[PDB]
């Protein structure tokens, strides 16, 4: 039942993609206000 998962070298990189996509939102609060 390991085959199913084996999300170690894909489900790792994606964790550092939400931080990236959460940096271009900070710049929005600064411009609208």
From Swiss-Prot:
It comes from Rattus norvegicus (Rat). This is Choline-phosphate cytidylyltransferase A. It is found in: Cytoplasm, Cytosol; Membrane; Endoplasmic reticulum membrane; Nucleus. Disulfide bonds: none annotated. Homodimer. The serine residues of the C-terminus are phosphorylated. The inactive soluble form is stabilized by phosphorylation, the active membrane bound form is promoted by anionic lipids or diacylglycerol, and is stabilized by dephosphorylation. The N-terminus is blocked. Belongs to the cytidylyltransferase family. The gene is Pcyt1a. The cytidylyltransferase may interact with membranes through its amphipathic helix. Catalyzes the key rate-limiting step in the CDP-choline pathway for phosphatidylcholine biosynthesis.
């Amino acid at each position: 039942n390991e085959k199913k998962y084996h999300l170690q070298e894909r489900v790792d990189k994606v964790k550092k993609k939400v931080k990236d996509v959460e940096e271009k939102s900070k710049e929005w609060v600064q411009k609208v206000e």
